[PDB]
Symmetry: C3
Subunit: 255 residues, 3 copies
Amino acid sequence: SVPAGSVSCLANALLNLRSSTDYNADHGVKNSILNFSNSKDASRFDGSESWSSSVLDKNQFIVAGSDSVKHFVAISTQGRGDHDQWVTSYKLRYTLDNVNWVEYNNGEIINANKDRNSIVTINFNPPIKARSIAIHPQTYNNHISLRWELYALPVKSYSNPSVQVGEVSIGDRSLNSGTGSRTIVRHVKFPVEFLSVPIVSIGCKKVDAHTDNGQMRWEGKSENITTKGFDLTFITWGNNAVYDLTFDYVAVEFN
Amino acid sequence: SVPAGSVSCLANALLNLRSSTDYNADHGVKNSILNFSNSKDASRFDGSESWSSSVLDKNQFIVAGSDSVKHFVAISTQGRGDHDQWVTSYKLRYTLDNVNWVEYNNGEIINANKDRNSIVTINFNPPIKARSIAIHPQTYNNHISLRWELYALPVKSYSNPSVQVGEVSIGDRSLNSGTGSRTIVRHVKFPVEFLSVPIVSIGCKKVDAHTDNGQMRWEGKSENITTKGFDLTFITWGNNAVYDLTFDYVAVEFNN
Amino acid sequence: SVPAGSVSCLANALLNLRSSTDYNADHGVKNSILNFSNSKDASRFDGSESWSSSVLDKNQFIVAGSDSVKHFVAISTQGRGDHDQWVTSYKLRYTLDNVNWVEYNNGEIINANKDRNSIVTINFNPPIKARSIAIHPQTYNNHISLRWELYALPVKSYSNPSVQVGEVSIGDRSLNSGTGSRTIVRHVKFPVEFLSVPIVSIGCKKVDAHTDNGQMRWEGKSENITTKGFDLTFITWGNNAVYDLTFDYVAVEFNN
Ligand SMILES: [Ca+2]
Ligand SMILES: [Ca+2]
Ligand SMILES: [Ca+2]
Ligand SMILES: [Cl-]
Ligand SMILES: [Zn+2]
């Protein structure tokens, strides 16, 4: 079973494909998408409804890859739509760093197809975590020919952040006197405008302040965050005299 | 108009393409880039100056995509270069998550080409945020055959920075005695060397210090930052005695 | 020489490729990887063991690209496996932004191949920092035909991190009385669950505490981290009364 919500990688043209060999360009990996089907006009040939290797041995493969870390949850294979050709068993190989390749599950040989069109699906628990994956047919019927699809987790909503950083201080004696709940606002303009409204984290890196009968009171808050900047509100209360406070900030936009 | 400073996606080989069907490999999406043209020698066929479908109906397309989120600002289409074939109208589809596709602009049919070579450009306002985008020919002259280019915003430099994190303390009594402005430096080494110089944000997560007639004074600064590490300078002044301090740090490396 | 531990980009299918021209589909970029080799059977053509241009001039190229920034450390070229065709000199161009192209080493003409199968390697010092790169044959032997590989630095463990952010407080008087080492835990849930265990940095943004004979004491520690959340353990010791503390936190997810 293909888990609900998963991404069809070839359907969405998310992976580059490279076969070991092709019978010819009209039998190439571009024709390997699961359920691939073309013209039924038998007078002209518009391509095999599969990838088909040229060499017939145990060393053929399609490699599927891209820069990003995919979490593959399953793989589906299928035979050739237009001729009695199919892969009947295959091994999997993969790589997360693109330098070291590993055998999936110690070189597990997986039972594949029995006919032209029936879909056989394999599920990975836990997901294979890879940048490139390769299918390696071991046995076949008539010829090494397949359609297939790879399934991956969708991308997390938090992914691909943009970040801007900086520091901000009171800079003067605004909170160094008076009584009660006291506030002073520093307006921060981000060096560059965000696309979406960031979330902002702050951290104190300087405290110069007087206790009030032994009590220390200071707070920093970010507020009125927009795409262009925000307000760092420096806060004190009781009778505390804050001479200076400094925060670093980290602003993060996603999605 | 193609907006100034845009990225030509197929030109920079930035998108994978997948057609519904190919007339044959010599009419493949590999031959679809705007203005593609090959040998003019009529005696030998080196492929169409177009992508060309095999099936002729309303259901053909090219899908274009990649792991990343594009900000598509425009699209251009053109007919076949070497025969009288072009797409007269098409719809667009796109997807951000690669699970749910949306009809561009509620399924708007866009008037496309009426010759081989004139370029028809469509602007997107606002930009289309998608991982994958598909052109869906609705009407054609003679055959479903086209050349195209997709245009997108350049990558902004504040996106996907690298990060490294860690913690640093005084770890001893260095600032816990003495008078006036007092500093001790902690030389911090990042777990992995960066390829270029990061910035280094810090925040305090431990105070253990004595007041000086009721005044608290401490500070931390990251200085002398390199690809390999930085110095966290712990500071006190007056007659504050600082028993220990701790910072979490976050080193952020941009555009690499 | 190819530096030990480089990534072979074409081998791992990390780049889209686009030629200026193909002799035909059976001579396309898909057949261009270093050492590419097909059936040795002379009674049916299964494609060239090379890419081969259609037009024979000095304006042919393959463009290799993708979304992410690469650091290319070397190129390797080869001639055609199956006929006496090979590139004898070439130039390189690249782009980091996919708007502005630059000429490798001010258009240096690199001496290339001499036969079908010997591999000629060029080292890039420093690495070419590029999203796309293009090989431009200048001279050739019989036909513009080649095989190649591009080598890149492996991705750093620290790249493409994701970040989540929030705040936590004691929010009550738990730490405000008693004596000796006292702790209170706040369980934090991440707005979205992470795919793997993050690291969690914190920095204080509120202190409301009493000194203990002039000594200030407070600490925050992020503990018990999972995909779903963590514990912020607020800490005081000696006889300090902490009325409240607040932290911001930065949760960072690596290698995903
Ligand atoms: Ca057919
Ligand atoms: Ca031609
Ligand atoms: Ca052959
Ligand atoms: Cl404090
Ligand atoms: Zn990518």
